[PDB]
Amino acid sequence: GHIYAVGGFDGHTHLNSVEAYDPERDEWHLVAPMTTRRSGVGVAVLQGRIYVLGGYDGHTFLDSVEAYDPDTDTWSEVTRMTSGRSGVGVAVTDGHIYAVGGFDGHTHLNSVEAYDPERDEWHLVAPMTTRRSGVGVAVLQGRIYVLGGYDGHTFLDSVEAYDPDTDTWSEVTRMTSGRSGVGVAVTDGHIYAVGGFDGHTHLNSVEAYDPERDEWHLVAPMTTRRSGVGVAVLQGRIYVLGGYDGHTFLDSVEAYDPDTDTWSEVTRMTSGRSGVGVAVT
Template sequence: MNVRRRNLSVAVLRGAVYAMGGFDEHRDHRTAERYDSKTNQWSWIAPMNTARSNACAALLNDKIYFAGGCDGYNVLDSVEVYHPDTNRWTFVAPMITGRANFSFVAFNACLYALGGHNTTSSELSTEKYDPTENKWTKIPSMDAYSSDLNAEVMNDKIFVIGGYYEANNFGVKCFNDKENRWYQLPNMNVFRCLLSICVIKNLPNASDYS
């Protein structure tokens, strides 16, 4: 990359990898860059409005939404969106709660902010963003507070895995938006935080794993 980054966020949009924000032992970055696998090159895109590390990125409607994190002094509630056609970042409505080290996923045309912590609490509400109304609303709590967790969407549900929980970090939960409720799933065999998870689509034997 063009600069060193840790605690950054990444997203894949239109076949390119975007690396945004992060920290380099001296400062939080507001810069962002894009990797083109065809040319094997990183190139700068427009810088963000706010420097952020420990933030989260998610894709929705062919745009990158970048939310929360830290600016070196404060935990942020602000959210900005990158428009690839204009190479511009613009702010949208801030989250109800500032948060860092959380998980952020797109699900059924909305964005969900899950878990995390801020300077006053690690017991944060769960909330979702509707871009048609530019509004955040609270949804039912996960019933366990966590940071450094990860979430993915599979089989029309949100799965939240691992993280620093109140009691342990073996936990797995899933959210069913049709019922507007969370379900506790069997725990992992090993406790994990600061983990990464992914969904591999179109496996011919997917039912063996679900």
């Protein structure tokens, strides 16, 4: 597999470029660009295609969606979401894509919508309790976990879980820190919350959720403090890409091996990308 880094902001330009990472060659290169510039974009993989949704293009908050097919190196339009959403979280489960929260240009949303492949149409599902943009989303067992974010007032440490079978939300133990712009990975039965911004500092800490014990614990921190990051799991390793450290729009990438609790540097992206979306396919 490859890691795809989608869009983002490089400090001057909202990007429509997309690049792919090969972990054996430890190299990044551009692929075909997307049609729309997008930072704060949500990304998911459904039946081998990469779906990119929402974001901000430099002028407008987007409700538009596009899909990439790696085999043909071609982007195709997909039906629009019910609302524009930047800083949106994205989950795939049951053959559905969920878009969670986000900022529509005026307010932070607690609404959540689902993409129905029966119809190529989006529709709202039950809302979360808290409004959240810059939110991290993970699928674990059958449930969608929503972590952190920003609600317009508070940098959130709270976590909620969605059950798609019942279209209902439940509370989960809060994280050790508020984390807006947080990255999320699931590997080996744990959810990792990576980085973020807590209102005073960008974070290099990383914490892991054990669902057996409903407990968060810190693990080894990354080298660079980062919010607006992309996170991917590939070949047992957690890759953290891009983001913003409070000064610089980052092109740096780090990899974490859960078996050694060790972060290692890997090759930089072709561009700095904050608010970058990530897919593994």
